[PDB]
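[retry 2/3] Mov34/MPN/PAD-1 family: previous attempt timed out, resubmitting with same input.
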Amino acid sequence: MKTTPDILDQIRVHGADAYPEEGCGFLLGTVTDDGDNRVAALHRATNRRSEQRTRRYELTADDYRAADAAAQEQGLDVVGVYHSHPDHPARPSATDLEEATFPGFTYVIVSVRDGAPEALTAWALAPDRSEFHREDIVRPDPEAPLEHHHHHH
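[retry 2/3] Mov34/MPN/PAD-1 family: success.
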């Protein structure tokens, strides 16, 4: 998972944005030349819809499929998921580990205590799906060549 400091902060802010409501967040981005994922866009699974007068991409729902569509709208896809819980500083629990259906996604665990975003951690799920392994937070190379999966809508 490649990510920039600006994105990392936006992640913790989205945790405070989601709270006190029950919502997680999806990681939308591009596939780096290494074969690894870079998070470039963020979207929390919580409905943020005021009375705005404009045309819709589809509808507001913030469900995975809605995020999938929004991803395509941005020319990206869901490269990972993240969820905050007020228990343990930063590591997946038993149930959310068990509910991890996507062993190819990067799972970010972030400490948000009733609205207060403390620290963020990125975890990679084992291909056999028994547990998570810790990955270090890496910024995209200071050049970043052409993408091969990225589209532009």
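[retry 2/3] Mov34/MPN/PAD-1 family: The longest strand covers residues 116-125.
[retry 2/3] clearing retry counter.
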